[PDB]
From a paper:
We also present structures of AvaR1, in isolation (2.4 Å resolution), in complex with avenolide (2.0 Å resolution), and bound to a synthetic DNA oligonucleotide (3.09 Å resolution) derived from its natural binding site. Each monomer is entirely helical and consists of a DNA-binding domain (DBD; composed of α helices 1–4), and a ligand-binding domain (LBD; consisting of α helices 5–13). The dimer interface is formed via interactions between the two LBDs and is formed mainly through hydrophobic packing interactions.
The structure of AvaR1 was determined to 2.4 Å resolution using crystallographic phases determined from anomalous diffraction data collected from SeMet-labeled protein crystals. Notably, the structure of AvaR1 undergoes conformational shifting upon ligand binding, and a structure-based superposition against the ligand-free structure illustrates that binding of the hormone results in an ~10o shift in the DBD of each monomer. This shift results in an increase in the distance between the two DBD in the dimer upon binding of the ligand, which would preclude DNA binding by the ligand-bound homodimer.
Numbering used by the authors:
A (entry chain B): 8 to 218
B (entry chain A): 7 to 218
Amino acid sequence: AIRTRQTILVAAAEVFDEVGYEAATISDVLKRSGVTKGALYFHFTSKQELAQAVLAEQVASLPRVPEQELKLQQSLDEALLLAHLLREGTGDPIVQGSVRLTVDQGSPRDHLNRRVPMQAWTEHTQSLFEEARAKGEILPHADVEALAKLFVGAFTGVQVLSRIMTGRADLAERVADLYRHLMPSFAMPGILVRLDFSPERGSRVYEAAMK
Amino acid sequence: RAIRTRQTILVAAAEVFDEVGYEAATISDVLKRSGVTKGALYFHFTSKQELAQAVLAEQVASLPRVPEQELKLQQSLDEALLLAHLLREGTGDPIVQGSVRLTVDQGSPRDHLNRRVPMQAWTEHTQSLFEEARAKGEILPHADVEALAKLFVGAFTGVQVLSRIMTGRADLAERVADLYRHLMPSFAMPGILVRLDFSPERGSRVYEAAMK
């Protein structure tokens, strides 16, 4: 049961990533997972429940990197880690599939709650910014709620454009560009000098998070 | 008569694609919504694919023109807020909403929708305005204008997505203004940011002029 649920979920995420929710079927998930019909239907009744469980595990399946000196470096590290996990070279399969389900508009008919992962990303980002403000890293009257929405929104679209134009190959640089152009508007100048946008730190954070 | 019929079918297909997406859409749905005969549909379009490609091909031309301005960055801002209005539903443009959904929706690897083409056209259009702004001393003299255009097109797309999910695009004007207000200080020359107008009143004047 324990690894079996995960095996099914990973397979469903890969199927949803390739064809989307509507074109996917339970049969495809069975083939890809390589588990019995019994094991699948023990954990999930339907395609709907599968896709909802993929969405519900989006945030928890991001590896958190150890707490940092600078909260804004933590925010930067997470965004570049997420960019790496979305690159198809080395997939986290849950994240890619979950993101596709979230961004794909779907139908009013389907019962997929796409607010849940976005609300969770927004709230997580807002907390980091609130913690950064208490540690003297942000300008005095920064609208931290509006900033969180901006970052989550902007990241999503940079990731979408990057998928369309390069299959996410340039995503690290697009995300670094985004953060380099947004952070000056609210970060204390003395924090900006200290932030590390390098690919080398991107690697170190990624390698540590995998094991 | 045949020009109106083609357009009526296209508008209907755009609305259907907007509601259920490319994959879930069918020719039958487009027929019901358009209210034309099967003969009239297949005269103009062979398939669902050709319908969706024609929706994408009309994306750019269905953006209303904003007048040339003194401040090129104001022109860029005006366009983005106008696009935000056209994506908010009411009398808001069915071709644009459906085209945007087709562009952003990931689709299948086997479908023959070229989603690069409209994004490349948006990127190139934005890059031109920024190139003109750079020559007029509005933005830094060696600003990476290609990278900036990609950032703006990418960021706008995602702000629009997040806004759809959380509010059905109700807050989109403010989210877009926020984006522009927080991105522009990193590459605008000293005088410039204070001269930009993010007001809803200017948004109106631009929208009303564009409808006529």
